[PDB]
Amino acid sequence: SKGEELFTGVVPILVELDGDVNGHKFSVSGEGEGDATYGKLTLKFICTTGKLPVPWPTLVTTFVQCFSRYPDHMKRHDFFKSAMPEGYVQERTIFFKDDGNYKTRAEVKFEGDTLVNRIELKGIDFKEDGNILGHKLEYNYNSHNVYIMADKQKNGIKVNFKIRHNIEDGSVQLADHYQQNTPIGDGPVLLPDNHYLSCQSALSKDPNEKRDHMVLLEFVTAAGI
């Protein structure tokens, strides 16, 4: 595959997000590297506007599935890498149960040797004292499966999954994800058969970082075929 070759080694990653949740505006910058051979991602995110108005875990999914490890026997189903270097647009609506929703639009593409994820996020209908704006979510992350289906109509894919964020009282805050990806270029891409990505994420802090931030270590592997 075309893009396939772009991911054989360690690739630097840059993430830039501008967000507005219920009028609370903020920006985040992230840097790190991905090693698709091992489905590995290592990144550090910094809120460059001061304090993040929402819990960091709620932004993990928004912050480059092209770094997922696709088993050799499943390479023909790797839409993400096939869209590179031109990239793909990734759009989501994330519904937080009994609370508001995030709508995101992002462009993932290479800028030189760096894989960049530029995101615009808009959140509305949140409860000021809810689990999100109220900061009631634990700083951790559960393993989840991400379900992918082709969408030949748009020469792209449809993705859906549920993220369960742990609330400090022991309960869970469901975040229902509806996602669509379509190529940026007019080039050809690989439309996959149904499969899923198995994802695990570990959140941590940089003991010397005084800015509001998040350190992320993530491993993702395609499966189901």
Side-chain angles (χ1 to χ4, degrees):
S1 179
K2 39 173 288 191
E4 235 182 62
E5 198 175 64
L6 291 172
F7 295 87
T8 59
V10 178
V11 179
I13 298 166
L14 190 63
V15 175
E16 306 295 340
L17 173 150
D18 283 328
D20 176 327
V21 174
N22 277 43
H24 295 90
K25 294 178 187 167
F26 59 101
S27 296
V28 171
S29 288
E31 297 179 24
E33 60 192 11
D35 200 349
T37 297
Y38 310 94
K40 188 183 189 168
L41 284 175
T42 54
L43 294 121
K44 177 186 169 179
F45 302 91
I46 297 173
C47 182
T48 63
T49 47
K51 299 189 180 180
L52 190 71
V54 300
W56 282 103
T58 69
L59 300 182
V60 168
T61 55
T62 296
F63 296 145
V64 293
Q65 295 168 309
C66 46
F67 286 103
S68 302
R69 174 173 78 70
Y70 271 73
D72 181 88
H73 75 271
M74 290 177 73
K75 60 193 156 184
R76 63 183 270 254
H77 305 285
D78 190 346
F79 164 92
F80 308 105
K81 293 191 190 59
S82 77
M84 304 292 158
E86 300 63 36
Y88 56 76
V89 165
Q90 177 160 308
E91 306 170 81
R92 290 211 182 99
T93 298
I94 296 173
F95 296 96
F96 291 86
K97 193 180 180 173
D98 298 317
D99 210 333
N101 64 88
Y102 288 164
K103 281 189 176 287
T104 61
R105 181 178 196 286
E107 283 189 28
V108 183
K109 67 186 163 172
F110 275 95
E111 289 297 345
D113 290 334
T114 300
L115 186 284
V116 178
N117 181 17
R118 288 178 184 164
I119 313 121
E120 300 183 310
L121 181 153
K122 182 70 161 293
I124 65 177
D125 295 319
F126 284 87
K127 294 176 188 179
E128 169 174 303
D129 53 330
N131 294 321
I132 290 71
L133 291 181
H135 295 277
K136 308 183 181 178
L137 302 183
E138 305 186 342
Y139 188 73
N140 51 34
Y141 217 88
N142 301 312
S143 296
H144 294 93
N145 284 334
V146 170
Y147 297 96
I148 301 173
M149 313 185 333
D151 190 329
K152 299 189 180 180
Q153 299 180 0
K154 307 180 168 59
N155 189 44
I157 53 169
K158 281 284 190 37
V159 178
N160 73 281
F161 55 99
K162 296 186 160 278
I163 288 298
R164 318 164 237 85
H165 295 295
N166 307 301
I167 303 173
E168 303 183 306
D169 66 3
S171 190
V172 50
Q173 170 65 69
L174 177 61
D176 275 294
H177 286 59
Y178 293 78
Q179 169 191 340
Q180 330 160 290
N181 297 63
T182 49
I184 288 176
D186 197 5
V189 297
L190 296 170
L191 301 168
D193 281 333
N194 291 6
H195 65 286
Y196 66 97
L197 303 181
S198 174
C199 317
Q200 76 183 81
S201 313
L203 314 191
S204 60
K205 295 285 182 185
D206 178 343
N208 297 306
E209 184 55 70
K210 307 302 176 338
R211 290 168 294 174
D212 198 357
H213 68 292
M214 170 175 70
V215 175
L216 173 68
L217 170 68
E218 188 177 318
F219 294 96
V220 180
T221 310
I225 294 181

PDB file of all heavy atoms in Angstrom, residues 8 19 38 73 75-76 88 101 118 130 141 143 146-148 188 193 195:
ATOM      1  N   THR A   8       6.373   2.430   8.569  1.00  0.00           N
ATOM      2  CA  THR A   8       7.217   1.315   8.959  1.00  0.00           C
ATOM      3  C   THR A   8       8.163   1.607  10.121  1.00  0.00           C
ATOM      4  O   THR A   8       8.644   0.681  10.764  1.00  0.00           O
ATOM      5  CB  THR A   8       8.016   0.781   7.732  1.00  0.00           C
ATOM      6  OG1 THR A   8       8.823   1.821   7.182  1.00  0.00           O
ATOM      7  CG2 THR A   8       7.059   0.309   6.679  1.00  0.00           C
ATOM      8  N   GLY A  19     -10.932  24.213  21.076  1.00  0.00           N
ATOM      9  CA  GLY A  19     -12.236  23.777  21.539  1.00  0.00           C
ATOM     10  C   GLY A  19     -13.082  24.843  22.201  1.00  0.00           C
ATOM     11  O   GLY A  19     -12.571  25.837  22.728  1.00  0.00           O
ATOM     12  N   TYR A  38       4.095  -1.658  16.065  1.00  0.00           N
ATOM     13  CA  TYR A  38       3.717  -2.204  17.360  1.00  0.00           C
ATOM     14  C   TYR A  38       2.406  -1.601  17.882  1.00  0.00           C
ATOM     15  O   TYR A  38       2.046  -1.820  19.046  1.00  0.00           O
ATOM     16  CB  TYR A  38       4.864  -1.943  18.352  1.00  0.00           C
ATOM     17  CG  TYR A  38       6.213  -2.371  17.794  1.00  0.00           C
ATOM     18  CD1 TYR A  38       7.035  -1.461  17.141  1.00  0.00           C
ATOM     19  CD2 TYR A  38       6.614  -3.716  17.831  1.00  0.00           C
ATOM     20  CE1 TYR A  38       8.227  -1.873  16.518  1.00  0.00           C
ATOM     21  CE2 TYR A  38       7.795  -4.132  17.227  1.00  0.00           C
ATOM     22  CZ  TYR A  38       8.592  -3.218  16.572  1.00  0.00           C
ATOM     23  OH  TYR A  38       9.755  -3.649  15.951  1.00  0.00           O
ATOM     24  N   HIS A  73      -2.286 -10.189   7.716  1.00  0.00           N
ATOM     25  CA  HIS A  73      -3.447 -10.741   7.023  1.00  0.00           C
ATOM     26  C   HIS A  73      -4.642  -9.788   6.936  1.00  0.00           C
ATOM     27  O   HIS A  73      -5.629 -10.092   6.277  1.00  0.00           O
ATOM     28  CB  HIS A  73      -3.888 -12.077   7.644  1.00  0.00           C
ATOM     29  CG  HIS A  73      -4.595 -11.945   8.956  1.00  0.00           C
ATOM     30  ND1 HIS A  73      -3.932 -11.930  10.169  1.00  0.00           N
ATOM     31  CD2 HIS A  73      -5.911 -11.802   9.248  1.00  0.00           C
ATOM     32  CE1 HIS A  73      -4.809 -11.780  11.144  1.00  0.00           C
ATOM     33  NE2 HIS A  73      -6.015 -11.700  10.614  1.00  0.00           N
ATOM     34  N   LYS A  75      -4.030  -6.237   6.343  1.00  0.00           N
ATOM     35  CA  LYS A  75      -3.537  -5.003   5.732  1.00  0.00           C
ATOM     36  C   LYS A  75      -4.464  -4.419   4.664  1.00  0.00           C
ATOM     37  O   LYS A  75      -4.575  -3.209   4.522  1.00  0.00           O
ATOM     38  CB  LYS A  75      -2.136  -5.244   5.173  1.00  0.00           C
ATOM     39  CG  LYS A  75      -2.096  -6.335   4.101  1.00  0.00           C
ATOM     40  CD  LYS A  75      -0.666  -6.785   3.794  1.00  0.00           C
ATOM     41  CE  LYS A  75      -0.662  -8.207   3.206  1.00  0.00           C
ATOM     42  NZ  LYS A  75       0.707  -8.733   2.980  1.00  0.00           N
ATOM     43  N   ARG A  76      -5.170  -5.269   3.927  1.00  0.00           N
ATOM     44  CA  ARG A  76      -6.053  -4.730   2.907  1.00  0.00           C
ATOM     45  C   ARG A  76      -7.245  -3.956   3.490  1.00  0.00           C
ATOM     46  O   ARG A  76      -7.970  -3.282   2.761  1.00  0.00           O
ATOM     47  CB  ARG A  76      -6.553  -5.860   1.978  1.00  0.00           C
ATOM     48  CG  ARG A  76      -7.385  -6.929   2.676  1.00  0.00           C
ATOM     49  CD  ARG A  76      -7.791  -8.062   1.720  1.00  0.00           C
ATOM     50  NE  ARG A  76      -9.070  -7.735   1.108  1.00  0.00           N
ATOM     51  CZ  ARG A  76     -10.230  -8.306   1.412  1.00  0.00           C
ATOM     52  NH1 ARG A  76     -10.312  -9.276   2.313  1.00  0.00           N
ATOM     53  NH2 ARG A  76     -11.333  -7.845   0.852  1.00  0.00           N
ATOM     54  N   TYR A  88      -6.900  12.225   5.846  1.00  0.00           N
ATOM     55  CA  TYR A  88      -8.335  12.020   5.912  1.00  0.00           C
ATOM     56  C   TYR A  88      -8.998  12.982   6.866  1.00  0.00           C
ATOM     57  O   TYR A  88      -8.357  13.547   7.764  1.00  0.00           O
ATOM     58  CB  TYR A  88      -8.672  10.558   6.300  1.00  0.00           C
ATOM     59  CG  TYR A  88      -8.068  10.030   7.604  1.00  0.00           C
ATOM     60  CD1 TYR A  88      -8.583  10.398   8.857  1.00  0.00           C
ATOM     61  CD2 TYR A  88      -6.987   9.177   7.567  1.00  0.00           C
ATOM     62  CE1 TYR A  88      -8.021   9.903  10.051  1.00  0.00           C
ATOM     63  CE2 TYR A  88      -6.417   8.685   8.733  1.00  0.00           C
ATOM     64  CZ  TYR A  88      -6.938   9.045   9.963  1.00  0.00           C
ATOM     65  OH  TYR A  88      -6.368   8.475  11.079  1.00  0.00           O
ATOM     66  N   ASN A 101     -22.929  17.013  24.292  1.00  0.00           N
ATOM     67  CA  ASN A 101     -22.261  16.306  23.213  1.00  0.00           C
ATOM     68  C   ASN A 101     -21.109  17.115  22.616  1.00  0.00           C
ATOM     69  O   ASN A 101     -21.100  18.351  22.660  1.00  0.00           O
ATOM     70  CB  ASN A 101     -23.280  15.924  22.133  1.00  0.00           C
ATOM     71  CG  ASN A 101     -23.913  17.132  21.439  1.00  0.00           C
ATOM     72  OD1 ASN A 101     -23.388  17.638  20.446  1.00  0.00           O
ATOM     73  ND2 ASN A 101     -25.045  17.592  21.963  1.00  0.00           N
ATOM     74  N   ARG A 118      -5.080  17.994  13.324  1.00  0.00           N
ATOM     75  CA  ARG A 118      -5.619  19.337  13.587  1.00  0.00           C
ATOM     76  C   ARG A 118      -7.103  19.174  13.848  1.00  0.00           C
ATOM     77  O   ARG A 118      -7.837  18.696  12.987  1.00  0.00           O
ATOM     78  CB  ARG A 118      -5.422  20.246  12.357  1.00  0.00           C
ATOM     79  CG  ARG A 118      -4.007  20.692  12.089  1.00  0.00           C
ATOM     80  CD  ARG A 118      -3.940  21.535  10.811  1.00  0.00           C
ATOM     81  NE  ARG A 118      -2.573  21.912  10.458  1.00  0.00           N
ATOM     82  CZ  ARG A 118      -2.191  22.375   9.264  1.00  0.00           C
ATOM     83  NH1 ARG A 118      -3.076  22.534   8.277  1.00  0.00           N
ATOM     84  NH2 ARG A 118      -0.917  22.651   9.040  1.00  0.00           N
ATOM     85  N   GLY A 130     -22.340  18.968  35.937  1.00  0.00           N
ATOM     86  CA  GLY A 130     -22.356  17.576  35.524  1.00  0.00           C
ATOM     87  C   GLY A 130     -20.984  16.926  35.665  1.00  0.00           C
ATOM     88  O   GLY A 130     -20.049  17.550  36.164  1.00  0.00           O
ATOM     89  N   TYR A 141      -8.268   5.286  32.221  1.00  0.00           N
ATOM     90  CA  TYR A 141      -8.896   4.905  30.956  1.00  0.00           C
ATOM     91  C   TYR A 141      -9.056   3.409  30.818  1.00  0.00           C
ATOM     92  O   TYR A 141      -8.139   2.648  31.125  1.00  0.00           O
ATOM     93  CB  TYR A 141      -8.039   5.433  29.806  1.00  0.00           C
ATOM     94  CG  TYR A 141      -8.871   5.905  28.649  1.00  0.00           C
ATOM     95  CD1 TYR A 141      -9.329   7.213  28.616  1.00  0.00           C
ATOM     96  CD2 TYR A 141      -9.239   5.040  27.616  1.00  0.00           C
ATOM     97  CE1 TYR A 141     -10.141   7.679  27.590  1.00  0.00           C
ATOM     98  CE2 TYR A 141     -10.069   5.501  26.562  1.00  0.00           C
ATOM     99  CZ  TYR A 141     -10.502   6.821  26.574  1.00  0.00           C
ATOM    100  OH  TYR A 141     -11.283   7.336  25.577  1.00  0.00           O
ATOM    101  N   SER A 143     -10.024  -0.238  28.588  1.00  0.00           N
ATOM    102  CA  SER A 143      -9.752  -0.775  27.255  1.00  0.00           C
ATOM    103  C   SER A 143     -11.092  -0.853  26.542  1.00  0.00           C
ATOM    104  O   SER A 143     -12.110  -1.135  27.167  1.00  0.00           O
ATOM    105  CB  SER A 143      -9.096  -2.147  27.353  1.00  0.00           C
ATOM    106  OG  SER A 143      -7.828  -1.988  27.978  1.00  0.00           O
ATOM    107  N   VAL A 146     -13.238  -0.668  19.069  1.00  0.00           N
ATOM    108  CA  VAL A 146     -13.705   0.333  18.127  1.00  0.00           C
ATOM    109  C   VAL A 146     -14.157  -0.435  16.892  1.00  0.00           C
ATOM    110  O   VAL A 146     -13.357  -1.141  16.277  1.00  0.00           O
ATOM    111  CB  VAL A 146     -12.542   1.283  17.770  1.00  0.00           C
ATOM    112  CG1 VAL A 146     -12.923   2.191  16.613  1.00  0.00           C
ATOM    113  CG2 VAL A 146     -12.158   2.098  19.015  1.00  0.00           C
ATOM    114  N   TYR A 147     -15.430  -0.289  16.531  1.00  0.00           N
ATOM    115  CA  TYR A 147     -15.998  -1.020  15.400  1.00  0.00           C
ATOM    116  C   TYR A 147     -16.010  -0.235  14.109  1.00  0.00           C
ATOM    117  O   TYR A 147     -16.563   0.865  14.035  1.00  0.00           O
ATOM    118  CB  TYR A 147     -17.401  -1.480  15.780  1.00  0.00           C
ATOM    119  CG  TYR A 147     -17.340  -2.445  16.942  1.00  0.00           C
ATOM    120  CD1 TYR A 147     -17.529  -2.001  18.255  1.00  0.00           C
ATOM    121  CD2 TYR A 147     -17.026  -3.792  16.736  1.00  0.00           C
ATOM    122  CE1 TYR A 147     -17.403  -2.885  19.333  1.00  0.00           C
ATOM    123  CE2 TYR A 147     -16.901  -4.677  17.801  1.00  0.00           C
ATOM    124  CZ  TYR A 147     -17.090  -4.220  19.094  1.00  0.00           C
ATOM    125  OH  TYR A 147     -16.967  -5.109  20.146  1.00  0.00           O
ATOM    126  N   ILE A 148     -15.391  -0.826  13.087  1.00  0.00           N
ATOM    127  CA  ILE A 148     -15.250  -0.186  11.798  1.00  0.00           C
ATOM    128  C   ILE A 148     -16.003  -0.908  10.696  1.00  0.00           C
ATOM    129  O   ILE A 148     -15.982  -2.132  10.616  1.00  0.00           O
ATOM    130  CB  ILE A 148     -13.761  -0.114  11.404  1.00  0.00           C
ATOM    131  CG1 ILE A 148     -12.990   0.673  12.467  1.00  0.00           C
ATOM    132  CG2 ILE A 148     -13.596   0.553  10.031  1.00  0.00           C
ATOM    133  CD1 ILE A 148     -11.466   0.663  12.265  1.00  0.00           C
ATOM    134  N   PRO A 188      -6.880   6.841  -4.307  1.00  0.00           N
ATOM    135  CA  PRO A 188      -7.624   5.652  -3.891  1.00  0.00           C
ATOM    136  C   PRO A 188      -7.351   5.287  -2.444  1.00  0.00           C
ATOM    137  O   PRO A 188      -6.291   5.587  -1.906  1.00  0.00           O
ATOM    138  CB  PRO A 188      -7.124   4.585  -4.856  1.00  0.00           C
ATOM    139  CG  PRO A 188      -5.723   4.963  -5.056  1.00  0.00           C
ATOM    140  CD  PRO A 188      -5.757   6.474  -5.187  1.00  0.00           C
ATOM    141  N   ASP A 193     -13.533  -4.599   5.376  1.00  0.00           N
ATOM    142  CA  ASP A 193     -14.620  -5.489   5.732  1.00  0.00           C
ATOM    143  C   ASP A 193     -14.780  -5.114   7.215  1.00  0.00           C
ATOM    144  O   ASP A 193     -13.888  -4.476   7.793  1.00  0.00           O
ATOM    145  CB  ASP A 193     -14.191  -6.950   5.655  1.00  0.00           C
ATOM    146  CG  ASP A 193     -14.176  -7.486   4.238  1.00  0.00           C
ATOM    147  OD1 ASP A 193     -14.934  -6.971   3.389  1.00  0.00           O
ATOM    148  OD2 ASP A 193     -13.411  -8.438   3.998  1.00  0.00           O
ATOM    149  N   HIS A 195     -14.521  -4.976  11.060  1.00  0.00           N
ATOM    150  CA  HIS A 195     -13.507  -5.450  11.989  1.00  0.00           C
ATOM    151  C   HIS A 195     -13.492  -4.451  13.131  1.00  0.00           C
ATOM    152  O   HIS A 195     -14.271  -3.512  13.147  1.00  0.00           O
ATOM    153  CB  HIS A 195     -12.114  -5.525  11.348  1.00  0.00           C
ATOM    154  CG  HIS A 195     -11.552  -4.202  10.933  1.00  0.00           C
ATOM    155  ND1 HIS A 195     -12.001  -3.516   9.822  1.00  0.00           N
ATOM    156  CD2 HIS A 195     -10.546  -3.453  11.454  1.00  0.00           C
ATOM    157  CE1 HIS A 195     -11.296  -2.407   9.677  1.00  0.00           C
ATOM    158  NE2 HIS A 195     -10.406  -2.346  10.648  1.00  0.00           N
TER     159      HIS A 195
END
